[PDB]
Amino acid sequence: MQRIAINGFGRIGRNVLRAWFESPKQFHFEIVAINDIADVHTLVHLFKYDSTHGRFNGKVDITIENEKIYLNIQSNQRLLKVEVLQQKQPELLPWASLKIDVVLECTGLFRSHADATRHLEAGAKRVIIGAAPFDHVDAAIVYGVNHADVKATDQIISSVSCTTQALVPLVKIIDDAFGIETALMTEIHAVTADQSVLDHAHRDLRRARASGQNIIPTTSSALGALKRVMPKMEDRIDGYSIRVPTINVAAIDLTFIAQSPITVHHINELLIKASQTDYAEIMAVTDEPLVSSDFNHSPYSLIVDLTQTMVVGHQAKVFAWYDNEWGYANRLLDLCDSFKS
Amino acid sequence: MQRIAINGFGRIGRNVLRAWFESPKQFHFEIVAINDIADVHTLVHLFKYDSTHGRFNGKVDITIENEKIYLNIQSNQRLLKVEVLQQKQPELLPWASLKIDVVLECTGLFRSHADATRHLEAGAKRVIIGAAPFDHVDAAIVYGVNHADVKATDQIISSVSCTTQALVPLVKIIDDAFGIETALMTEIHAVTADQSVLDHAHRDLRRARASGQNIIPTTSSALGALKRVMPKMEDRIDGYSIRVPTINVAAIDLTFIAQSPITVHHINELLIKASQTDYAEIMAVTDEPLVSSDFNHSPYSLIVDLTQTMVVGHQAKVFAWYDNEWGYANRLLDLCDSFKS
Amino acid sequence: MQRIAINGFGRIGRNVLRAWFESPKQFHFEIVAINDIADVHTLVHLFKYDSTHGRFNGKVDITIENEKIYLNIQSNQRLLKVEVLQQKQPELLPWASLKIDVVLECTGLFRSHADATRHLEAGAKRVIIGAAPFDHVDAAIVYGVNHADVKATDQIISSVSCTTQALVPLVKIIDDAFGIETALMTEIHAVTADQSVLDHAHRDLRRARASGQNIIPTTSSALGALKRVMPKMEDRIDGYSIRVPTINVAAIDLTFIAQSPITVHHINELLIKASQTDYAEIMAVTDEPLVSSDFNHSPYSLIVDLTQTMVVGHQAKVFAWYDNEWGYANRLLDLCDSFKS
Amino acid sequence: MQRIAINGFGRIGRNVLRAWFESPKQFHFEIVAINDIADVHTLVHLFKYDSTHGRFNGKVDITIENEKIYLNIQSNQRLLKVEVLQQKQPELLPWASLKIDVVLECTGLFRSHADATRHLEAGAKRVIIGAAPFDHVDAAIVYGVNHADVKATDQIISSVSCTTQALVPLVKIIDDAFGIETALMTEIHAVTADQSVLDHAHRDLRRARASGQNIIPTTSSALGALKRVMPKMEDRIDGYSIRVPTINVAAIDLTFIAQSPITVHHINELLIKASQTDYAEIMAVTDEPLVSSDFNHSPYSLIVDLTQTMVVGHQAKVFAWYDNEWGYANRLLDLCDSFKS
């Protein structure tokens, strides 16, 4: 077993661990540690109880061996003993002792090549930044598109954002088949934890406004990040995110100019075949009249609504839902199960 | 005296009546009657207290002259005596005696020429259908664009949807300045009164879902309507509407292909100018990072977000807000004021 | 084995049928028919997809025959053939042909003895009204309290409201143990299906207001119902309800005067003992810091929050959560199962 | 001219400034400075644009004079020139230089006697803490009850909370007429700035949960505070609070044992009388069926719902609304204006 550590037990950190247990197939690695700036009792409480994902179907038992605090978790006929830490500064983590092979960096606070490496300076072999890269990176991966393009010499990988992981395959698939000249992306997204309950000072003057009562248009790391995966799309794609007051799940609305003839039928049939072949693992298509709440806890990177496809002359639009928490947390798992074979 | 009546004291019908009193200028016509299938006290209560636009600044007192009911409404140094009625069957209404010059159909249930004529058989002389056209109509009017081409012979007239009232000005202005090859619309709309609170049976399986907790991509009457008003744009444009849980205000994401050189600046500059020159009583533009609730009670048909503008090659995206309720309600008064000229 | 039918396939009716399959306990009766005013297609979609409780872990297949429409539902290793009907007039329903032993009236439209007998005319042997009695009932029942006092001759029963199911055991337990001079109830309830999305005509001028954006004080059926169940308490307990914009789950704030010595411990300890002994069936207690989301999909009639328990002098206050849909649906099955052996 | 300064330009700070300009009666004193840890541009935007209360009706202009930042604000035919600051440490502020007669402390952090003194040792003459007292104070004041009891020796004063200012009149008005043996409070409150948007680590584990999706019981400084104001109520009152997913406006449900015969009529007449006579400035009473968003922007410390009063036995309950932002903000101004002569 490879040994994995999560730094930052937030919406992502925590759902990774849930996903470890909830998965239909046992992952061939173990999660052996978690860090956060909060205490264990809080961490365990938010792990157990989730406004978004429900009560956790299993048992968590805190034990104290030595000074080392450990969670004994059990669910889906599977066990894990995890060490709980409360270190603010990553360079001071015990990754060497615990022998951590990969660190899922899920704090938002350590996106640089410099901060990433601090975990390596603390004994870790590899790191995965769970976010768009800030600066330099050894690699920018979207599981199902370029996970095979990881070299073993790669220490600072990025798994990008959820948005990027829905977006990239749509573009890959279509550019490849019909040719995309340019494209523009509207993302309609559930409220995220960085927003404000009420009008409160914030870096973003948009995201300063009450989360629960506003439509809030804003920036998306997705575009800058998608261009580190496909540099050819520089100057050829742009877009933005809209925040609305639902708790979870998002939609991506992508408008593009095709270089060959295109029909609704042809566009939809392409995406279906990909869902059944190369992109089986991460993509699915639906012709059913669903809404956001229907895709909660869905492990796919994207579910395409084929009813929503529109073509006019050479311009086309497609639409796809993703569970921005669940989908992405399963892609972090799937990515670690790839490094070993 | 121009005499107007409102059939359906709804979100629209009540906001029309308020708008009469709240306008800067006094309109050269009077509202003299309203009809709803609800009782008077319910109508008065809802008229006085609004979850969205606030309390009515004024007095409303019920008097029962003859065997008729009247409302005595004093506000903004103005007074009206409005007769209240309760007749589900539009032809049974006394439009003959009251000398109704124009009826505003705000029920939602009577949009066919056939159905709307029932007001003319009641003695009314003209009918503005406050909605998109079901079958045929003598005219289809977006105030500020084609309000002038209404005829004396015209009797059944449509003010279209609010979406349509914001989309047309944009398309007119851009097709005229740059050439639109094709375009596509995403409308992000607040909840509406036809939707459902929890999951409940409904003719549309999408709006059937819980309004408060869902993103609900649905359809827009706003495109069929725009093809009426601008027939030369047939087949150049399509779109769809998303419902999201805020109480009020909507936006449009318009994504078009341009037939000549375009830049973010030159787009934004054309819009600003157009607002200042030809389209001033219905169009504004803002430079600031605002959100939906900043447009509550805005009378404009559309406010353009200058920051939200984007160009990649020949493709471009512009973005406009509007108060779906209040915006539209001012265009109904604005339209009526154009007949007595 | 007994044959059950559901008139009205909404929040309750649909959760009745699911709870039947999801129940870890198999029930000894079968549900063989349902009726609503919407088409099978709408009914299936809504059964399969739910904003509150999620997707159904099962398969639904429609069987259209010469005239009859059936549903073949398979879940949790159980199967059911359910005839689907569309009759707004309960007297005409084929309850004879189908041999319906019990009907559940989850429509909220047939609460009188008069109207509930319309089922008895159509061939049914017994009706349970899924609401508070309106005029006369052969019995008002709270499962876990007086479920044993159902005489086999009783043809028209009532299973009161979700709120009554919780209030009664709380009062029973406390009045028996300490003695209630008087009590006052505050219910804080998620939004219900009868409320309005936006401000719209309604019978109640409070429930006419936009559900999503408003605290809404309102009345409770539960007090009338409680007097029918525990008649000695006439005039000793009043109360009211408050709707807030959550999707599901209610709470109950009972404030009472005690006739003997009360302390926080002594109250909680008794409530614990009940949850363990007499009422381990339908009652649970937590010390943990939970919120509404945590009781979503809990089948208990009431979960007491012991930390919220408070005493000053002779007055005290206790707090209980319940899943207003799921608890109430489970108590209907629980009830139907009690008419056996 | 008294000179006032605001520390913490939040929901209270901003609403305090706004309310200065909106008041019918000019205040015979002036706000001359604000301090927040945020950039002036953020503070100005957030002041101008408000999800809860609207656009500011007036013009704000920034000037940079002698390396000093100022705000020139014009509205309601009034002008204020206000210096903006950014000192996290209160001992460092220039209160002496500006000759500040009263600091308003709206940060939430500096509530201990020793903290609040940092403003005094920084040059200010008096300080009002805009929250319940943390440890001790020179005086805890509710405008309209004990406002005339302030001494010249009271330099650190508490203006308590939104909640306390509604509760103290109710408790006092009734205790005086009828006698209160004991009382228990339930407060239903809108979301506060300090809550979390999604489940996120937090000191309080109830307030850690998603604000827009939960009912969340919590604690209320209002009783500690009311005991400081009415020492005789020690051991005679208690309560707790509930956050629900609305943006603004709270209500208070108060249940008490009377020591004298009570009826509904007699309670409502006493409160109507008090609203008309001694509590006229802070209290009001409505007989209408209204909901939360109707009391938005109301300046009153409380508004009894005459319709909501209930009595059974010696025990009774009364219900009152208050705009938790706007109400309190006026009481700060009203209390500053009571320092004259």
Ligand SMILES: NC(=O)c1ccc[n+]([C@@H]2O[C@H](COP(=O)([O-])OP(=O)(O)OC[C@H]3O[C@@H](n4cnc5c(N)ncnc54)[C@H](O)[C@@H]3O)[C@@H](O)[C@H]2O)c1
């Ligand atoms: N939320 C999504 O849907 C989503 C999708 C894709 C990417 N991401 C990215 O994932 C990252 C995590 O976001 P999240 O949703 O988990 O939010 P979150 O704020 O809930 O998670 C942050 C967590 O890190 C903890 N933390 C803060 N400082 C720390 C430190 N110095 N050391 C250790 N722990 C620390 C916080 O207490 C919290 O538990 C962000 O970069 C976000 O942009 C999020």
Ligand SMILES: NC(=O)c1ccc[n+]([C@@H]2O[C@H](COP(=O)([O-])OP(=O)(O)OC[C@H]3O[C@@H](n4cnc5c(N)ncnc54)[C@H](O)[C@@H]3O)[C@@H](O)[C@H]2O)c1
């Ligand atoms: N609300 C918007 O944002 C908006 C914008 C543009 C256009 N519209 C159109 O305006 C119409 C009204 O929508 P709304 O939002 O006001 O909905 P609403 O439900 O609030 O208004 C409908 C009103 O009609 C009344 N009514 C029902 N049957 C009637 C009958 N037989 N005779 C008379 N009155 C009757 C209802 O009681 C209600 O007051 C719809 O057709 C809609 O397409 C609405």
Ligand SMILES: NC(=O)c1ccc[n+]([C@@H]2O[C@H](COP(=O)([O-])OP(=O)(O)OC[C@H]3O[C@@H](n4cnc5c(N)ncnc54)[C@H](O)[C@@H]3O)[C@@H](O)[C@H]2O)c1
């Ligand atoms: N939801 C709760 O928390 C709760 C709890 C306890 C009891 N109740 C009561 O249960 C009943 C149902 O309420 P609900 O929450 O399920 O609401 P709902 O509106 O979803 O249920 C009503 C259902 O009955 C259908 N219906 C309408 N007319 C009909 C007819 N003539 N014949 C047959 N079916 C018809 C509707 O189409 C709908 O599916 C009411 O009496 C309600 O007050 C509700």
Ligand SMILES: NC(=O)c1ccc[n+]([C@@H]2O[C@H](COP(=O)([O-])OP(=O)(O)OC[C@H]3O[C@@H](n4cnc5c(N)ncnc54)[C@H](O)[C@@H]3O)[C@@H](O)[C@H]2O)c1
């Ligand atoms: N909002 C209400 O309903 C209400 C009612 C009564 C009392 N209060 C009290 O008011 C206080 C503030 O609440 P709020 O609603 O203004 O919340 P808020 O979060 O909007 O206020 C905090 C503000 O102070 C600023 N700030 C933080 N640290 C600072 C520092 N060191 N120096 C200067 N400025 C700093 C923040 O950047 C922000 O602008 C709390 O104590 C709360 O109990 C609020």
